[PDB]
Write a protein that binds this ligand. Sequence first.
Ligand SMILES: *[C@@H]1O[C@H](CO)[C@@H](O)[C@H](O)[C@H]1NC(C)=O
Ligand SMILES: *[C@@H]1O[C@H](CO)[C@@H](O)[C@H](O)[C@H]1NC(C)=O
Ligand SMILES: O[C@H]1[C@H](O)[C@@H](O)CNC[C@@H]1O
Ligand SMILES: O[C@H]1[C@H](O)[C@@H](O)CNC[C@@H]1O
Lengths: 497, 496
Amino acid sequence: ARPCIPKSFGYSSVVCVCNATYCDSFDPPTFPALGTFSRYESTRSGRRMELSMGPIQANHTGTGLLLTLQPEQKFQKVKGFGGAMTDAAALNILALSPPAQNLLLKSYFSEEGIGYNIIRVPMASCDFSIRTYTYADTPDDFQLHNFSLPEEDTKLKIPLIHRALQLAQRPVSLLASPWTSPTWLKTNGAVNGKGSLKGQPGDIYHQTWARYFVKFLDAYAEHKLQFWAVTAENEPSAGLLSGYPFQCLGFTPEHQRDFIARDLGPTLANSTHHNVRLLMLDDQRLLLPHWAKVVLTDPEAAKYVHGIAVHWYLDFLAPAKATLGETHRLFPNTMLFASEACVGSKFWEQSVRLGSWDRGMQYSHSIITNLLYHVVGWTDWNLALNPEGGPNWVRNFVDSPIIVDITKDTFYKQPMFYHLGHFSKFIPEGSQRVGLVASQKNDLDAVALMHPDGSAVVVVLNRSSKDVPLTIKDPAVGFLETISPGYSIHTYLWHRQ
Amino acid sequence: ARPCIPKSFGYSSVVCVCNATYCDSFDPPTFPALGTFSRYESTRSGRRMELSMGPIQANHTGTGLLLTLQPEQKFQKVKGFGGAMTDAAALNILALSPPAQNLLLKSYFSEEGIGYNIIRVPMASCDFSIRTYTYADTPDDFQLHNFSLPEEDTKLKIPLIHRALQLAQRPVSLLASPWTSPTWLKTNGAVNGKGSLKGQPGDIYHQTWARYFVKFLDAYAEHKLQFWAVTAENEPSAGLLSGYPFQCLGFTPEHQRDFIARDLGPTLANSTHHNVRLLMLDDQRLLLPHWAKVVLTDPEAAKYVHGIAVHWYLDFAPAKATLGETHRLFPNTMLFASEACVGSKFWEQSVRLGSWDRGMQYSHSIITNLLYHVVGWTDWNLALNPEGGPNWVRNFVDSPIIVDITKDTFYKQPMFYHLGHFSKFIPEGSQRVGLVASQKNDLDAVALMHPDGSAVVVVLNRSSKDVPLTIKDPAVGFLETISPGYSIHTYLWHRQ
Ligand SMILES: *[C@@H]1O[C@H](CO)[C@@H](O)[C@H](O)[C@H]1NC(C)=O
Ligand SMILES: *[C@@H]1O[C@H](CO)[C@@H](O)[C@H](O)[C@H]1NC(C)=O
Ligand SMILES: O[C@H]1[C@H](O)[C@@H](O)CNC[C@@H]1O
Ligand SMILES: O[C@H]1[C@H](O)[C@@H](O)CNC[C@@H]1O
């Protein structure tokens, strides 16, 4: 429908420029006829999810790299893909003119964009906020008589969420996560730094905090928003470290276990929101499988836990298999879910690198490794940031797939946006990842899934500089002859009957 | 003989203040009779390797955790402990007046201090230099006729090293590591960034680079200094990273494999320096076991590799899966910690004067290393200024001694004493042995056997609670003690 308007900022690749009247968009999706495949291509050299089609060949010799589909090797089903509606993201989106806001939201949520179906919502303030607040800042208000949603929710977050759901291709799932409790529930009486809930699981500080989840959900329900899930706490390990700079609330895995068992599970289970799922951890995978053991080998906490949530930030010093794989080995019936990722990365590179192809590859690299190790979904951090990677009240600036330039009523779609798009647009909720074996050692990253309609989707990422010729075999159908260009990512689709 | 002069700077504990006429020091060791032990204690509250003594008796009065010496279980033998004489360390030491310099050097190398017996020496410049330079900056000098040592070596590093050896109670070993080759040998023609050697193992570029190691060893040998070992490159993986900010030289594990096999191994071994050890990796431990499998399964490379050098940064990949697994796979190739440092969280503060937490990080990681077969442990810069500098790129990192040029004073941090709890009492040749815990506890502990047969046990308490403790020697009896919250003890006793 409309192509990328490219612009260079002197990094490895370009961004796609959008404004009030223009943004790159897709045509409505069409089924490739049986015996054909669809290919979506993005390249460092400038191609941005271009649609092309080819034949599936009945025969193939000799020769070189072959990746064979295994429809009988069935693994996890997919929950979905999305990002976080933080104070910082919402504030940036709304600072644009209304027509630019819509193109922005369609890019993420529409069928003319990348079909996101998860939105993470912080419960009150985090570091990507411009002030600290919780929903119950009256000291010692154990009854939560003064619990209320501030404007951050009622004027920025919630209206943006509604407009996304309205644009949305697919049913959208909301995920909620707290950074800090009110400061009077905490041993250090501050939103940041080392500190946890006062007293012990089962007591009034613990029961009040559990009740605060219920009040949060009650309040969102009044604005016609239902949650798919909540996490027990964002990065519980963070609140264990002295001088921790921004909002946190410390739990050892034992504390989380008992908090879930005593307070948070029963409270949620006895509320009108009993169907909301609870995910534990919500922190770096380096904490697995230990954290999952402590919590899930206690059946009183296990009965309340639907899933384990993981953060991507390092990560690089904890190989998937030893963390993600082991945990699945031990609790195959507790889903793994990536609830937060950003870049990053690095201490000598700027927070925002407009046009960075490398950062795009890190996303898709991580998404593929995640899928290969059982993870059922993936959630980017901030949906939009400014060219500084903010705002952020502790200046903890990071990058985002969409960068808003408020003076120019313009936004930039980075490579990360598209690299994400290669998964989000084409893997709906209910897809099942399947086997895919390589006939020879290669430099590609690849993953195959089965769409709920029976069709196939395979994503191939090439992080080397060299083109790599390859064929994908599907026994039901034949052979896709293709080439993977250096510094590219392709998604391949085709019907099976 | 002289106690710590404490000073607080607002962090969890104190530094010890030393200057031209005063520094904290030890008396010569003694050999207490069988049935008595010596304890060195440092606490966050202020004690600094304080010596006391007591009895190891036949009756067991304690009721809590029991640690039993098991001398029959024998593990790795120790190579030693030390730190890096970088350009920055040397500049910092040399900005003190002479008598202050001596007290500093004694703190680390002397019997009166902590008994260091390793020095790592960068081969030309790294980030802790105040300028970029190699030993062969003149382009296209493939025979290296113009190879030479600048002032940083001949005026700063080398004199300091000679003096450290004059003072040292023990034989000191030197370990050398390159950050970058001459830039005209690299794919990118720069000192930093994504770039390897040009061409391929075997060719003129590789041959020249390998010869540069020999020229370096010759040059130091003219200064009457011999090396124990060299690493094949500092952080080879760094140079695979686009825009890497400081001096680097990229090798994939295969490239390191082939460079050692074809060039570095043959050249070193066909030189008068054939006894110098070669250590591979010299990088984060997350690269293990993989890097070890690639290099060490090719017999042509393996025959040249004495050991695997690891950095601790960047550790927070577990010990078992890296060090444990690498030892299982290659049990006759020593593991050695070539560079350790802290390591500041982004809300810090590269230098935190008096930080007890950083102390604990050092001793905790030394203990973990000992429990996973590592034979040696090298700190990074011997000394830095209060800004954690000089560093030509950016400072991130603290150091056990902080020099204040303007007051002719230097500060010994908790890191210094945490290292000392080990380096002072574990000489080269010491062997790690069993130490069995009777019940789950929060302590970190390790036992070793001195070459003279005596026991050394280090007990670290990272919790805030006092832990009542009994240590048992099957040969002697029971030692009743308490490990206070936020403390580190070293226990020493004779076994016959
Ligand atoms: C919007 O973008 C297109 C560039 O594709 C351009 O022709 C149009 O003028 C832009 N609008 C504004 C207000 O700059
Ligand atoms: C050096 O340290 C000792 C002990 O603290 C002290 O008595 C002396 O004054 C110090 N020298 C200077 C110049 O302050
Ligand atoms: O608040 C999040 C930070 O803003 C994000 O940059 C990475 N760290 C984890 C935290 O949950
Ligand atoms: O030059 C070294 C750095 O100065 C040290 O701070 C951390 N490790 C990376 C490098 O090998």
